[PDB]
Design a protein around this motif. Structure first.
Motif, PDB file in Angstrom:
ATOM      1  N   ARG A 123       5.857 -10.024 -10.935  1.00  0.00           N
ATOM      2  CA  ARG A 123       4.653 -10.800 -11.089  1.00  0.00           C
ATOM      3  C   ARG A 123       4.614 -11.882 -10.305  1.00  0.00           C
ATOM      4  O   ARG A 123       3.754 -12.563  -9.413  1.00  0.00           O
ATOM      5  CB  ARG A 123       4.166 -10.943 -12.484  1.00  0.00           C
ATOM      6  CG  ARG A 123       3.794  -9.472 -13.011  1.00  0.00           C
ATOM      7  CD  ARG A 123       3.216  -9.460 -14.380  1.00  0.00           C
ATOM      8  NE  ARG A 123       4.267 -10.009 -15.492  1.00  0.00           N
ATOM      9  CZ  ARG A 123       4.823  -9.254 -16.070  1.00  0.00           C
ATOM     10  NH1 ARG A 123       4.875  -7.781 -15.643  1.00  0.00           N
ATOM     11  NH2 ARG A 123       5.842  -9.719 -17.093  1.00  0.00           N
ATOM     12  N   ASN A 173       6.365  -5.089  -5.967  1.00  0.00           N
ATOM     13  CA  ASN A 173       6.160  -4.096  -6.898  1.00  0.00           C
ATOM     14  C   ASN A 173       7.724  -3.556  -7.604  1.00  0.00           C
ATOM     15  O   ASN A 173       8.613  -3.664  -7.103  1.00  0.00           O
ATOM     16  CB  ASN A 173       5.556  -2.955  -6.454  1.00  0.00           C
ATOM     17  CG  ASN A 173       4.064  -3.275  -5.818  1.00  0.00           C
ATOM     18  OD1 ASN A 173       3.195  -3.348  -6.769  1.00  0.00           O
ATOM     19  ND2 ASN A 173       3.887  -2.985  -4.777  1.00  0.00           N
ATOM     20  N   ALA A 210      -2.459  -8.888 -12.788  1.00  0.00           N
ATOM     21  CA  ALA A 210      -1.216  -9.393 -13.507  1.00  0.00           C
ATOM     22  C   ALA A 210      -1.090 -10.872 -13.531  1.00  0.00           C
ATOM     23  O   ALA A 210      -0.037 -11.678 -13.522  1.00  0.00           O
ATOM     24  CB  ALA A 210      -0.225  -8.801 -12.451  1.00  0.00           C
ATOM     25  N   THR A 227       0.038  -4.656  -5.685  1.00  0.00           N
ATOM     26  CA  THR A 227       0.893  -5.540  -5.752  1.00  0.00           C
ATOM     27  C   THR A 227       1.070  -6.116  -7.218  1.00  0.00           C
ATOM     28  O   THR A 227       0.158  -5.843  -7.896  1.00  0.00           O
ATOM     29  CB  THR A 227       0.833  -6.828  -4.786  1.00  0.00           C
ATOM     30  OG1 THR A 227       2.095  -7.506  -4.672  1.00  0.00           O
ATOM     31  CG2 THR A 227      -0.339  -7.657  -5.291  1.00  0.00           C
ATOM     32  N   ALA A 228       2.157  -6.610  -7.689  1.00  0.00           N
ATOM     33  CA  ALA A 228       2.617  -6.825  -8.844  1.00  0.00           C
ATOM     34  C   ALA A 228       2.577  -5.895  -9.917  1.00  0.00           C
ATOM     35  O   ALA A 228       2.551  -5.933 -11.191  1.00  0.00           O
ATOM     36  CB  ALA A 228       1.690  -8.159  -9.431  1.00  0.00           C
ATOM     37  N   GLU A 229       2.769  -4.840  -9.293  1.00  0.00           N
ATOM     38  CA  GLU A 229       2.603  -3.274 -10.353  1.00  0.00           C
ATOM     39  C   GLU A 229       3.825  -2.969 -10.581  1.00  0.00           C
ATOM     40  O   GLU A 229       4.872  -2.968  -9.926  1.00  0.00           O
ATOM     41  CB  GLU A 229       1.856  -2.284  -9.665  1.00  0.00           C
ATOM     42  CG  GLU A 229       1.542  -1.070 -10.436  1.00  0.00           C
ATOM     43  CD  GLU A 229       0.433  -1.237 -11.326  1.00  0.00           C
ATOM     44  OE1 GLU A 229      -0.016  -2.313 -11.452  1.00  0.00           O
ATOM     45  OE2 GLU A 229      -0.201  -0.250 -11.809  1.00  0.00           O
ATOM     46  N   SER A 277      -5.464  -5.617  -5.562  1.00  0.00           N
ATOM     47  CA  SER A 277      -4.793  -6.730  -4.877  1.00  0.00           C
ATOM     48  C   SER A 277      -3.780  -7.399  -5.948  1.00  0.00           C
ATOM     49  O   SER A 277      -3.372  -8.831  -5.923  1.00  0.00           O
ATOM     50  CB  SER A 277      -5.557  -7.567  -4.387  1.00  0.00           C
ATOM     51  OG  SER A 277      -6.599  -6.955  -3.508  1.00  0.00           O
ATOM     52  N   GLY A 278      -3.351  -6.957  -7.258  1.00  0.00           N
ATOM     53  CA  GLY A 278      -2.551  -7.474  -8.009  1.00  0.00           C
ATOM     54  C   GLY A 278      -3.514  -8.388  -9.130  1.00  0.00           C
ATOM     55  O   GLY A 278      -2.715  -9.217  -9.931  1.00  0.00           O
ATOM     56  N   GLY A 320       2.240 -13.566  -1.985  1.00  0.00           N
ATOM     57  CA  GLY A 320       0.949 -12.816  -1.597  1.00  0.00           C
ATOM     58  C   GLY A 320       0.036 -13.380  -0.778  1.00  0.00           C
ATOM     59  O   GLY A 320      -0.728 -12.710  -0.080  1.00  0.00           O
ATOM     60  N   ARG A 349       3.507  -7.733  -0.386  1.00  0.00           N
ATOM     61  CA  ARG A 349       3.513  -7.080  -1.655  1.00  0.00           C
ATOM     62  C   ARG A 349       4.747  -7.057  -2.437  1.00  0.00           C
ATOM     63  O   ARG A 349       5.857  -6.749  -1.532  1.00  0.00           O
ATOM     64  CB  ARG A 349       2.769  -5.655  -1.479  1.00  0.00           C
ATOM     65  CG  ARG A 349       1.302  -5.986  -0.887  1.00  0.00           C
ATOM     66  CD  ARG A 349       0.646  -4.553  -0.640  1.00  0.00           C
ATOM     67  NE  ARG A 349       1.487  -3.622   0.444  1.00  0.00           N
ATOM     68  CZ  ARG A 349       2.112  -2.829  -0.005  1.00  0.00           C
ATOM     69  NH1 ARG A 349       2.323  -2.370  -1.262  1.00  0.00           N
ATOM     70  NH2 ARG A 349       2.939  -2.124   0.895  1.00  0.00           N
ATOM     71  N   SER A 398      -6.379 -13.430  -6.958  1.00  0.00           N
ATOM     72  CA  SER A 398      -5.384 -12.385  -6.921  1.00  0.00           C
ATOM     73  C   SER A 398      -4.164 -13.007  -6.008  1.00  0.00           C
ATOM     74  O   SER A 398      -4.391 -13.655  -5.237  1.00  0.00           O
ATOM     75  CB  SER A 398      -6.194 -11.124  -6.445  1.00  0.00           C
ATOM     76  OG  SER A 398      -6.364 -11.290  -4.982  1.00  0.00           O
ATOM     77  N   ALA A 436       5.060 -11.617  -6.814  1.00  0.00           N
ATOM     78  CA  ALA A 436       3.827 -11.183  -6.034  1.00  0.00           C
ATOM     79  C   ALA A 436       2.715 -12.414  -5.765  1.00  0.00           C
ATOM     80  O   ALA A 436       2.192 -12.589  -4.771  1.00  0.00           O
ATOM     81  CB  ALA A 436       3.252 -10.141  -6.793  1.00  0.00           C
TER      82      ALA A 436
END
Ligand SMILES: NC(=O)C1=CN([C@@H]2O[C@H](COP(=O)(O)OP(=O)(O)OC[C@H]3O[C@@H](n4cnc5c(N)ncnc54)[C@H](O)[C@@H]3O)[C@@H](O)[C@H]2O)C=CC1
Ligand SMILES: NC(=O)C1=CN([C@@H]2O[C@H](COP(=O)(O)OP(=O)(O)OC[C@H]3O[C@@H](n4cnc5c(N)ncnc54)[C@H](O)[C@@H]3O)[C@@H](O)[C@H]2O)C=CC1
Ligand SMILES: NC(=O)C1=CN([C@@H]2O[C@H](COP(=O)(O)OP(=O)(O)OC[C@H]3O[C@@H](n4cnc5c(N)ncnc54)[C@H](O)[C@@H]3O)[C@@H](O)[C@H]2O)C=CC1
Ligand SMILES: NC(=O)C1=CN([C@@H]2O[C@H](COP(=O)(O)OP(=O)(O)OC[C@H]3O[C@@H](n4cnc5c(N)ncnc54)[C@H](O)[C@@H]3O)[C@@H](O)[C@H]2O)C=CC1
Ligand SMILES: CCCCCCc1cc(=O)c(Oc2ccc(N)cc2C)cn1C
Ligand SMILES: CCCCCCc1cc(=O)c(Oc2ccc(N)cc2C)cn1C
Ligand SMILES: CCCCCCc1cc(=O)c(Oc2ccc(N)cc2C)cn1C
Ligand SMILES: CCCCCCc1cc(=O)c(Oc2ccc(N)cc2C)cn1C
Lengths: 257, 257, 257, 257
Positions: C170, C184, B252, C240-242, B248-249, C177, C182, B213, C173
């Protein structure tokens, strides 16, 4: 043709407006040998006539609500074919109230159960019953609709069932893939015809797709049929776990604004 | 806090590792008044203790397999609360064989039925039974998993049920939205604990998420809890029909390569 | 508040209808310390007034077309703050013809270049220049629109740039990360105001969202602001990555049919 | 064959491992008439030999970085063909450092610019320059990769460019669709070959796809070629704005756990 010698079983050919009819026509054109299912004895003569139109007398009854009929279908088919190369699952049902008006108004446990049983469960159920006789490079195909992905008025409980069906395409693809079997869906656009009893008019949707899709036209069963024939064929041997939109591009826009 | 005065019913608080426990803790911190459901008389004392920890004696039995218990839940709750501002649906079940090993090996009509009945249908069923007493700005929340979106080993029949559940979030959002009610899901990452009887070990998945992640760590019930509290609150008044990943991503990326 | 002590830099606060204004207001409410950027000397007085409204004199010029100004921004900020806890990227631009009428009519190499340079590249560019001073648990936020996901009339070249921007969320992230940072986006619905010179009227879109979104209303900068404050905070530490839709649920439907 | 009489221009045929080579081979098999582009005078003899292999002497230089060469390409082609029925865009480039190691380490304004200019902008740029001579039922095809959808190690800046490219498929489909022209992409899985200078080894990715994809094998240029030929043909007349995965189903799973 690109399906020469492929033996393909098609479910759900009810009339000449059935998506399965468009698929059968394209498969036969490309050299496939076909077999057909039906439900309801009053339809035996009609499906037998359709089968003959496509050069086949292989017709079998199968109500997919019934475990015994599913098993019997493949036992019967096996008396004719050593192996099955293709399966077309073109079967959908949701109770009238569950696909009309407000989502919660038509929601009951039994309506939910039946819609998911017939429209979703029946696809991997057929795949599992067929498995012993599936060729190593067999291809299984089902039909879905954009209502699985985004909320469309009236589609309601059928949208839930189709989401489960698209998920089943992915889990089936993993289960059957090591053997070499491919599993895909076509997300078809609406097909113009008079909405049958139990289905609400979708005239407004047809008009909206014609006015807003990239190609500015509704899709036909011939177009869905050709895409289906492609997916059932070795032309598509790199493609599995896919939900392919055949919808004049409508899924990809935000129309009407 | 940002949930001051909000009256929220939480289902599925089974232990202190329950996602519902993390949600309850965050909701209470932010000023909510809570009520709780349980299933199984042997759990009455445990859930009553949890409720007391969160300043409440509002505890009600509800097996969501049973229409009468669903109706009785809200009749009982209504004797205490004029209106309901939040509903947390943290209920999932699939039969052991249906979430272990090969997808088709564990597929039966009854396993399919139960998984979809309990894990999917029960969310809009609770929403419908609650509707007469839902506040105009109420917020309904369910929990899903990445297995609804992509095929994950063993998740199998639960992946189908969760896909139907995510679709129900969208159809519920349309149905309840004109009133002003919001409906969302959190797609939670795996929560580290010993896998209970009926669930396969997911240790390898936890290790894989920790290693791959974006945040290089598994999510906690505190993190899922805070995201849940946010979605239940007026902070999230612009958000509905959303499946929010709190993972935690991990969703993606393509990890492990 | 839930952002107590967090030091957050906001770009793109141009007026009190700016999405960044709604974010700043929510961040200040929840206890954040803020700093601001602007472009164009004629806006220095205006942004300084906004900063003062939010208890800050930390104002810096930065045209993100210019590498030297990006580097200078963080050197300047660093003279005040040892570390940066949040970054709000609320910067978008596409040339007038590239977001009006037919997609290809307004497509030129230079229009493509500028739209992607300003609206997409500038986000990870700011992140990279900020990195040495980012706190380990920092949170970076950008703004996108549904036009990145599906074709919306007129959005055209900006839709391409926003798709690249969401992809950058993405990849950022993953890059940031492991440190703990994070990244987003909020996919915001349209915000009602008179369309500025260079932007086509989106009145029809606003009417369509009000008529067809699940919540039957357009989103406000307050709603987008609160979602932004949440994502910038430790409440969202599992996220995250959202790309989070804050759009009254409009993305999730097929409206107007 | 199913492309009888169709006149199709293919870009990016560099070697017999080029995806464009697999597409050309399938198109020729199905009856298409082909034309080819190349960049770099040292490749003139090689592309001329490939063209001859596919029954054509129609070879034209075109560096898509150059507006004048794009215009000249179609002026030259037009001296041979009244109309163009198909266009294959199989052109990608990102600077070496921008697709190796950490995303931000290889990120510069110029690297971003070039990757998006060559890999993304060039597709609708070719479409626009071709438009006057496109047949009403023409079909345009580009190639993308899963890195546009989810973060894949090293793909980095190319992932952003491919996301913009997939968005361009959708906006092109709307722009050209009323005329009747279709626009699609294939999201191809990795093709096994020695990674050229400028591209990092993707051996680990190939091994991971072989071990984790549903079909447990990597895709071939023959498989991508046949899917491409299908999309360029009238078999696919219902399909536009689609990104079709031809990747052994790999996109649809979470592998390696
Ligand atoms: N017609 C349209 O606009 C669109 C249809 N679809 C899907 O395409 C598929 C075919 O639909 P159509 O051809 O349009 O309608 P259709 O009515 O001609 O086909 C439906 C078939 O399902 C069969 N069926 C229903 N319950 C069955 C059971 N218990 N056992 C065995 N068969 C049963 C019916 O006998 C019928 O043959 C369905 O899955 C439908 O949901 C998808 C998208 C668009
Ligand atoms: N635990 C994890 O890693 C993840 C869990 N989820 C979902 O989160 C939700 C909560 O799961 P957990 O907290 O982890 O486990 P949990 O076991 O603590 O909660 C499951 C709850 O479902 C209830 N339940 C099962 N059948 C019921 C019925 N017939 N009537 C009423 N309640 C019934 C159980 O009593 C239990 O309270 C579930 O929907 C689960 O699928 C999602 C993602 C990840
Ligand atoms: N306004 C809306 O309906 C929606 C806006 N968005 C996005 O939200 C973000 C903010 O937009 P708004 O607040 O509505 O408009 P806005 O005009 O108030 O903000 C745009 C900002 O971009 C800045 N900017 C433009 N070129 C710049 C450069 N070279 N260097 C530094 N700053 C530059 C402008 O000065 C302005 O501050 C944008 O990314 C926009 O695309 C998204 C969805 C909906
Ligand atoms: N090879 C793989 O595993 C995969 C490749 N793709 C995409 O498929 C497409 C073709 O790639 P490949 O056949 O594998 O490699 P390739 O190297 O054989 O083809 C790339 C082509 O791009 C051309 N090109 C680069 N800059 C150009 C410019 N300025 N003007 C005109 N042409 C230029 C090259 O000359 C070459 O012909 C690319 O878009 C690639 O990103 C996608 C997925 C997987
Ligand atoms: C409500 C949204 C309009 C649907 C448009 C497209 C559409 C999608 C469908 O899934 C469909 O199929 C059925 C639906 C219900 C039942 N009982 C049986 C069937 C075979 C028909 N049509 C026409
Ligand atoms: C098989 C894939 C691993 C799942 C990882 C995350 C995960 C996802 C879940 O949905 C889950 O919840 C259950 C699953 C089954 C049952 N019977 C009951 C429950 C409450 C637990 N976990 C841990
Ligand atoms: C064409 C589709 C309508 C857009 C609706 C929502 C929308 C989406 C946006 O991305 C937007 O932001 C801009 C767009 C262009 C420029 N030059 C500058 C900016 C800041 C404004 N709005 C209002
Ligand atoms: C980093 C992730 C691995 C990529 C696997 C698949 C893959 C995806 C691709 O997009 C690709 O194409 C290129 C990429 C870069 C350049 N400069 C030129 C080209 C033609 C090759 N390959 C092999």
């Amino acid at each position: 043709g690109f399906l020469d010698g492929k033996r393909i079983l098609l479910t759900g050919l009810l009339s000449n407006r059935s998506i399965a009819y468009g698929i059968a026509k394209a498969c036969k054109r490309e050299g496939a040998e076909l077999a057909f299912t039906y439900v309801g004895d009053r339809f035996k003569d009609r499906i037998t006539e359709f089968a003959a139109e496509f050069g086949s007398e292989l017709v079998f009854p199968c109500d997919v609500a019934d475990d015994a009929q599913i098993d019997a279908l493949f036992a019967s088919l096996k008396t004719h074919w050593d192996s099955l190369d293709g399966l077309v699952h073109s079967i959908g049902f949701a109770p009238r109230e569950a696909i009309a008006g407000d989502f919660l108004d038509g929601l009951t446990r039994e309506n939910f159960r039946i819609a998911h049983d017939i429209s979703a469960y029946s696809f991997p159920a057929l795949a599992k019953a067929a498995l012993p006789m599936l060729s190593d490079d067999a291809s299984l195909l089902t039909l879905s609709y954009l209502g699985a992905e985004r909320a469309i008025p009236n589609y309601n409980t059928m949208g839930l069932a189709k989401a489960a069906l698209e998920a089943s395409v992915r889990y089936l693809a993993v289960s059957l893939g090591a053997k070499g079997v491919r599993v895909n869906a076509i997300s078809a656009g609406p097909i113009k015809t008079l909405a049958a009893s139990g289905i609400k008019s979708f005239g407004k949707i047809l008009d909206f797709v014609e006015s807003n899709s990239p190609l500015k036209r509704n899709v036909t069963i011939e177009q869905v049929g050709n895409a289906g024939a492609f997916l059932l064929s070795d032309l598509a041997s790199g493609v599995t776990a896919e939900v392919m939109h055949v919808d004049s591009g409508f899924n990809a826009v935000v129309g009407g604004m």
